[PDB]
Amino acid sequence: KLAATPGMFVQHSTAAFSDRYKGQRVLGKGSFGEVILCKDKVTGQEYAVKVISKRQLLLKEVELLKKLDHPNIMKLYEFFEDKGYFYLVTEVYTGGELFDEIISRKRFSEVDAARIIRQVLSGITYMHKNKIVHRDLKPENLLLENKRKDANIRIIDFGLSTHFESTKKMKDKIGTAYYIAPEVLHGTYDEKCDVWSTGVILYILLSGCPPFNGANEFDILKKVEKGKFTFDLPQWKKVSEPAKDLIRKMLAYVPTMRISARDALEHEWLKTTDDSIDVPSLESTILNIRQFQGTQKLAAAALLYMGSKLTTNEETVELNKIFQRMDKNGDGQLDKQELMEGYVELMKLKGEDVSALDQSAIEFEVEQVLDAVDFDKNGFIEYSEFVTVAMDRKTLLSRQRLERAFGMFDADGSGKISSSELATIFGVSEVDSETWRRVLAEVDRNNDGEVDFEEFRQMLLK
């Protein structure tokens, strides 16, 4: 098919960054280049851009980020290349670094730490599934989305990340003293390095101190390479055994003996909670998902575009909680069984009896929801797919958002969407005549062979 994915929408622009964005301030420096809070000149929306000098050549971080769609992974909007520069426009997270909260609150609640680590493990479980290793996980590269109390966590800085193969092992030495796994120092490593790092992070969150420390960089790396850490400090008397157990498993010296991300999610400890949802909100969401009816590809791209690239964080904070709670196994994907239990979970909340339920009837209904909603036909409902679908359709199809989507689709400004433009949107040479025929047959009002902003408008407004 034509697989509708958020990533397909980030395309190499041939406009000047300067024509559409305006620098506001410096947020900081990354793995390689600095990040500049910018504003879209026309919509006043804020993004965090990463600028990279051509002199200091690979836009690798862009390709990785297009393949990832996860509620705890940094979002990428678009990117510009210059004579001298690259610009990677991304969503801006306004709660700042975990690092700073660490040095502020000093020590984390087991509840808060479990939540945080769960989301990080979820991000990497997803990444590892897609053959990507981060390689530089630390509180610096974890952002709180906003200032709210128990803010969601985003992974950032994929500038040192790479594709890995189960066949051939990685050799380049990459990371940060406190967080680097011994095998990266040794010169041969795999995706388990990401676990080790996350295990270090966890240790810090719970105790306030790193597990391997030293007077300087060099001292630390020796301590790290020896692998030995202890729970000998007084603040550990306040922490539960399972938490230590997980830590042990995540910092097991030998990679093959160390827990995978995917398995770490299932650990006892990470199910530590205290945090609930309004029934109405959940009901709205569940009802919006049930009522999404599949459609032609122009509409699919449009909705996914609006849902994945044109929605702010403020708008999706509730949707984001729901998804994580419906994702029982953490992997960043909703599956048929997860979906089934969601509806059941809601049914308990409504008093309706679990026993008196046609399990197979529901399971059937769920198969059909999945079919409607799974934009890329990978058998899973990903976050942006979920948002597009679960958001209130009048909220999503605000009169702004509609105008903005159409603009993006009508690349030559002709006031009409052509099949060539649609192909362009999908990142593919041409749209199957079958598909386009299917598309026009449902939309073309004047019947001029193309879709204008009224034809477009009503297409979605159903």
Ligand X SMILES: Nc1ncnc2c1c(-c1cnc3[nH]ccc3c1)nn2C1CCCC1
- Residue 331 in contact with Ca ion, rule: CB under 5 A: yes
Per-position b or e across 345-366, b if 16+ CB within 10 A of its CB = bbbeeeeeeeeeeeeeebeeeb
Angle at 264 between CA 260 and CA 270, to 5 degrees: 165
- Residue 69 in contact with Ca ion, rule: CB under 5 A: no
SS (H, E, C) 179-247: CCCHHHHHCCECCHHHHHHHHHHHHHHHHCCCCCCCCCHHHHHHHHHHCCCCCCCHHHHHCCHHHHHHH
* 136 classed as catalytic: yes
Q: How many Cα atoms occupy the beta-carbon half-sphere of 441 within 13 Å? A: 9
- Residue 376 in contact with Ca ion, rule: CB under 5 A: yes
d(CA 83, CA 327): 44
| Closest C-alpha among 399, 431, 405 to residue 418 | 431
- Residue 160 in contact with ligand X, rule: CB under 6 A: no
- Residue 285 in contact with ligand X, rule: CB under 6 A: no
Partner that binds at residue 35, options ligand X, Ca ion, none, CB closer than 5 to 8 Å by kind: ligand X
d(CA 319, CA 315): 8
Does 245 belong to an annotated binding site? no
- Residue 378 in contact with Ca ion, rule: CB under 5 A: yes
Angle at 270 between CA 332 and CA 100, to 5 degrees: 85
DSSP labels, 261-293: HHHHTT-SGGG-------HHHHHHHHHHHHT--
Does 130 belong to an annotated binding site? no
Nearer CB in complex with ligand X: 86/196: 86
Minimum CB distance to ligand X, residue 394 (Å):
29
Nearer CB in complex with ligand X: 137/156: 156
The residue from 150, 263, 448, 454 that contacts Ca ion (CB under 5 A) is 448
Does 122 belong to an annotated binding site? no
Binding track, positions 403-422, relative to Ca ion; x by CB under 5 A: -------x-x-x-x-x----
Question: Residues annotated in the binding site for ADP, as ranges?
Answer: 31, 50, 91, 93, 97, 140
Residue ranges that bind ligand X, judged by CB under 6 A: 27-28, 30, 35, 48, 50, 61, 74, 88, 90, 92-93, 97, 143, 156-157
Binding residues for Ca(2+): 327, 329, 331, 333, 338, 376, 378, 380, 382, 385, 410, 412, 414, 416, 421, 444, 446, 448, 450, 452, 455
The footprint of Ca ion (CB under 5 A) covers 327, 329, 331, 333, 338, 374, 376, 378, 380, 382, 385, 410, 412, 414, 416, 418, 444, 446, 448
